[PDB]
Design a binder for this molecule. Structure first.
Ligand SMILES: CC(C)(O)Cn1cc(-c2nc(NC3CCN(S(=O)(=O)C4CC4)CC3)ncc2C(F)(F)F)cn1
Length: 279
């Protein structure tokens, strides 16, 4: 009744997303219809209405009548942009700008103990003004599949994972912007873990204390040597490779925080370019 659906723009784990217009006000929004409401989800989603930041997609309204989530609408995601930019690549100053802004978004959310848990290029939304924003923060915790961006602690069965899972995912996305190919495109959970291990080396107690005690760890995992890191994201410079290395540390406690990543020398020359978007 209150929204005219314009077109289907996405499908998440929790429901279909439509571009829609408010019939009273004329505001254009993204309207997510949540699939099959538990009272704890209502309370958790209501708290996310408060979590406002320029690099977080705004949750405008929660409508529990007879659950719909009304979000800010952006015109493109980073997957479509990367695919449009595949001949030439995204220029490094724009990659750097986007990574910086996404680390600002993560630093804000993490400072409020809110995790994303499922970052992927389709969750990263851009506009014509050079902004990039994170979509879906806090929904995984509120409500309770691409594996390519999943942290190794998740894949090894850790129940009580941390803000570090989002840094991992963002490092994977960073690498993909630079190289124009997904870093770890696994098509099952074991294929995902084995692709990580084939690049970064099979983890052991030296690099990741406690790893051999993790729920899904098996002593029978093959033991791959770690690849030379300059083979992973050529031709990214040593500042970018250093930052990526720190985002992809196995040990979640060693992995760089969003806040510390913002201070990395890679961002010494950061700027805010505007992308040419074809809408
Ligand atoms: C993935 C998910 C799980 O995040 C759920 N999901 C959420 C959205 C969403 N989408 C938009 N805008 C769209 C962005 C993609 N582009 S595209 O590149 O032309 C198209 C993909 C080819 C169309 C416009 N704006 C806001 C949101 C929200 F606020 F809801 F996040 C889309 N899917």
């Amino acid at each position: 009744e209150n929204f005219q659906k314009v077109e289907k723009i996405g499908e998440g784990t929790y429901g279909v997303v439509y571009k829609a217009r408010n019939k009273l006000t004329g505001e254009v929004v993204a309207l997510k219809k949540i699939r099959l409401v538990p009272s704890t989800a209502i309370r958790e989603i209501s708290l996310l209405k408060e979590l406002n930041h320029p690099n977080i997609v705004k949750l405008l309204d929660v409508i529990h009548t007879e659950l719909y989530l009304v979000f800010e609408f952006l015109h493109q995601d980073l997957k479509k942009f990367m695919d449009a930019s595949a001949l030439t690549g995204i220029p490094l100053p724009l990659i750097k700008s986007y990574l910086f802004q996404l680390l600002q978004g993560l630093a804000f959310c993490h400072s409020h103990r809110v995790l994303h848990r499922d970052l992927k290029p389709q969750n990263l939304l851009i506009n014509t003004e050079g902004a990039i924003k994170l979509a879906d923060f806090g929904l995984a915790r509120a409500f309770g599949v691409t594996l390519w961006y999943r942290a190794p602690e998740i894949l090894l069965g850790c129940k009580y994972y941390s803000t570090a899972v989002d840094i991992w995912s963002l490092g994977c996305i960073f690498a993909e912007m630079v190289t124009r190919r997904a870093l770890f495109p696994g098509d099952s959970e074991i294929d995902q873990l084995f692709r990580i291990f084939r690049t970064l080396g099979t983890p052991d107690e030296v690099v990741w204390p406690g790893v051999t005690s993790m729920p899904d760890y098996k002593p029978s995992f093959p033991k791959w040597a770690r690849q030379d890191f300059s083979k992973v994201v050529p031709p990214l410079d040593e500042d970018g490779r250093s930052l990526l290395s720190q985002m992809l540390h196995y040990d979640p406690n060693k992995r760089i925080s969003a806040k510390a990543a913002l201070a990395h020398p890679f961002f010494q020359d950061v700027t805010k370019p505007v992308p040419h978007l074809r809408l």
